[PDB]
Design an enzyme around this catalytic site. Structure first.
Site, short mmCIF file in Angstrom:
data_model
loop_
_atom_site.label_atom_id
_atom_site.label_comp_id
_atom_site.label_asym_id
_atom_site.label_seq_id
_atom_site.Cartn_x
_atom_site.Cartn_y
_atom_site.Cartn_z
N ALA A 16 0.83 -1.21 0.00
CA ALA A 16 0.00 0.00 0.00
C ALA A 16 0.87 1.26 0.00
O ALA A 16 1.90 1.34 0.71
CB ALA A 16 -0.96 -0.02 1.21
N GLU A 18 0.64 5.86 -0.31
CA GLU A 18 -0.12 6.97 0.27
C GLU A 18 -1.39 7.39 -0.51
O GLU A 18 -2.28 8.05 0.06
CB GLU A 18 0.82 8.16 0.48
CG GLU A 18 1.69 8.02 1.73
CD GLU A 18 3.07 8.59 1.55
OE1 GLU A 18 3.33 9.72 2.03
OE2 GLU A 18 3.90 7.90 0.91
N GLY A 20 -3.01 4.84 -2.62
CA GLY A 20 -3.67 3.60 -3.06
C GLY A 20 -2.79 2.37 -3.02
O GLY A 20 -1.75 2.36 -2.35
N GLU A 21 -3.19 1.33 -3.75
CA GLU A 21 -2.49 0.05 -3.75
C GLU A 21 -1.21 0.04 -4.59
O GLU A 21 -1.04 0.85 -5.49
CB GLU A 21 -3.39 -1.07 -4.27
CG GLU A 21 -4.53 -1.40 -3.31
CD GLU A 21 -5.53 -2.39 -3.91
OE1 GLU A 21 -5.90 -2.22 -5.10
OE2 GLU A 21 -5.97 -3.31 -3.16
N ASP A 130 12.43 12.63 1.60
CA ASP A 130 11.92 11.46 2.34
C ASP A 130 12.87 10.28 2.16
O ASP A 130 12.47 9.15 1.91
CB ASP A 130 10.49 11.09 1.92
CG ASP A 130 9.77 10.21 2.97
OD1 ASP A 130 10.26 10.08 4.11
OD2 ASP A 130 8.72 9.64 2.61
N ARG A 134 12.86 2.59 4.12
CA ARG A 134 11.56 2.17 3.59
C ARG A 134 11.31 2.61 2.14
O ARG A 134 10.48 2.01 1.47
CB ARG A 134 10.43 2.65 4.51
CG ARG A 134 10.26 4.14 4.55
CD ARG A 134 9.22 4.60 5.56
NE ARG A 134 9.67 5.85 6.13
CZ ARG A 134 9.54 7.03 5.53
NH1 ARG A 134 8.89 7.13 4.38
NH2 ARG A 134 10.00 8.11 6.13
N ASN A 135 12.04 3.62 1.66
CA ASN A 135 11.92 4.13 0.30
C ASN A 135 13.07 3.66 -0.63
O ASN A 135 13.19 4.11 -1.78
CB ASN A 135 11.82 5.65 0.30
CG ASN A 135 10.47 6.14 0.76
OD1 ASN A 135 9.45 5.47 0.56
ND2 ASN A 135 10.44 7.31 1.39
N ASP A 148 10.04 6.56 -4.35
CA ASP A 148 9.21 7.59 -3.68
C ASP A 148 9.57 9.00 -4.15
O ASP A 148 10.16 9.79 -3.40
CB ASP A 148 9.30 7.50 -2.16
CG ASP A 148 8.21 8.32 -1.48
OD1 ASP A 148 8.42 8.76 -0.36
OD2 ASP A 148 7.16 8.56 -2.08
C1 LIG Z 1 7.36 -8.84 -4.12
S1 LIG Z 1 7.36 -8.07 -2.56
O1 LIG Z 1 6.14 -8.43 -1.86
O2 LIG Z 1 8.64 -8.29 -1.91
C2 LIG Z 1 7.27 -6.31 -2.90
C3 LIG Z 1 6.48 -5.51 -2.11
C4 LIG Z 1 6.41 -4.16 -2.37
C5 LIG Z 1 7.14 -3.62 -3.41
C6 LIG Z 1 7.93 -4.42 -4.21
N1 LIG Z 1 8.69 -3.92 -5.28
C7 LIG Z 1 8.52 -2.72 -5.98
N2 LIG Z 1 9.30 -2.54 -7.07
C8 LIG Z 1 9.18 -1.41 -7.76
C9 LIG Z 1 8.32 -0.41 -7.40
C10 LIG Z 1 7.55 -0.65 -6.28
N3 LIG Z 1 6.63 0.33 -5.84
C11 LIG Z 1 6.40 1.50 -6.58
C12 LIG Z 1 5.62 1.48 -7.73
C13 LIG Z 1 5.39 2.61 -8.50
C14 LIG Z 1 5.89 3.84 -8.16
C15 LIG Z 1 6.65 3.86 -7.01
N4 LIG Z 1 7.29 4.90 -6.39
N5 LIG Z 1 7.97 4.51 -5.29
C16 LIG Z 1 7.75 3.20 -5.16
C17 LIG Z 1 6.92 2.73 -6.23
N6 LIG Z 1 7.65 -1.78 -5.57
C18 LIG Z 1 8.00 -5.78 -3.94
MG LIG Z 2 8.65 11.91 -0.84
MG LIG Z 3 7.32 9.68 1.11
#
Ligand SMILES: CS(=O)(=O)c1cccc(Nc2nccc(Nc3cccc4[nH]ncc34)n2)c1
Ligand SMILES: [Mg+2]
Ligand SMILES: [Mg+2]
Length: 265
Positions: A16, A18, A20-21, A130, A134-135, A148
């Site tokens: 999740a 800030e 949405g999903e 930020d 976590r980012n 982020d």
């Molecule tokens: C497979 S897992 O459950 O380990 C897992 C959980 C959460 C994220 C990812 N990877 C993961 N990889 C790339 C991007 C991302 N999140 C995002 C998507 C689109 C725009 C964005 N901006 N900042 C972040 C972001 N997330 C992988």
């Molecule tokens: Mg930021």
């Molecule tokens: Mg942020």
């Protein structure tokens, strides 16, 4: 990069954000091989524009330690931001799962990746605001990438007190030097395998402590040179903090002389 929604298959919700999903998906466009993607999905028109400003700015970056934009979907609902997929997710949680399981050299390599990403952002006059473990997202080969992005102001989100330099808290002056403060916090997070910064303190306690010269102690087994670099990032005088090119150069020198890393409290 507007992407035809028919090119996108959403496969599972993975987190999740800030607005949405966050989902994992697959993107297949004519001329290109199929790739795995991460997808943020999305409110007022201002909120839509704030959401999409992430894509606007991410699309202008190209660096191995910055997540790559694949595209956006704006002509249908939900609106989407599609990026490369980082299989291991957020660095703070990845490190907690892997507590004590990576060597000092591996952790320094992660910090070096993050510092290279920041050096690039600073070079592009982009202040992150930020910067926190976590980012940072981590791919299959332990490659760390900054995530982020966005052009909205904090009240946007709320100022992340535990990661924020004292002058940015007090006066809302955010600069690459205040990012260097946050980077020192990220170093502490990495060397502590994803412990919460100042875990035993409230936000106000952190503000008061920093003002009264408190700094986070060396994490267990943390090389002193790494903790000293943290302390340098956490100088009250923002102009005395190392800039990101000096940070990268300091880490590269540690990696050349790994014997230096054996000195610990
Ligand atoms: C497979 S897992 O459950 O380990 C897992 C959980 C959460 C994220 C990812 N990877 C993961 N990889 C790339 C991007 C991302 N999140 C995002 C998507 C689109 C725009 C964005 N901006 N900042 C972040 C972001 N997330 C992988
Ligand atoms: Mg930021
Ligand atoms: Mg942020």
């Amino acid at each position: 990069k507007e992407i035809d929604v028919s090119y996108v298959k959403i496969e599972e919700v993975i987190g999740a954000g800030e607005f949405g999903e966050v989902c994992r998906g697959r993107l297949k466009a004519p001329g290109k091989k199929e790739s795995c993607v991460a997808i943020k999905t999305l409110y007022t028109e201002r909120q839509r524009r704030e959401f999409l400003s992430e894509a606007s700015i991410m699309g202008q970056f190209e660096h191995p330690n910055i997540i790559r934009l694949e595209g956006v979907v704006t002509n249908s609902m939900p609106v989407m931001i599609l990026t490369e997929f980082m299989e291991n997710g957020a660095l703070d949680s990845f490190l907690r799962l892997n507590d004590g399981q990576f060597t000092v050299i591996q952790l320094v390599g992660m910090l070096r990746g993050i510092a290279s990403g920041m050096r690039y952002l600073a070079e592009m006059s982009y202040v992150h605001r930020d910067l926190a473990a976590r980012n940072i997202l981590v791919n299959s080969n332990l490659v760390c990438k900054v995530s982020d992005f966005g052009l909205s102001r904090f009240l946007g989100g709320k100022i992340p007190i535990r990661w924020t330099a004292p002058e940015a808290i007090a006066f809302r002056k955010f600069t690459s030097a205040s990012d260097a403060w946050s980077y020192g916090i990220v170093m502490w997070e990495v060397m502590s395998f994803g412990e919460r910064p100042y875990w035993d303190m409230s936000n106000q306690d952190v503000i008061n402590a920093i003002e009264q010269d408190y700094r986070l102690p060396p994490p267990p087994d943390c090389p002193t040179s790494l903790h000293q670099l943290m302390l340098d990032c956490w100088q009250k005088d923002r102009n005395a903090r190392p800039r990101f090119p000096q940070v990268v150069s300091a880490l590269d020198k540690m990696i050349r002389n790994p014997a230096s890393l054996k000195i610990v409290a």
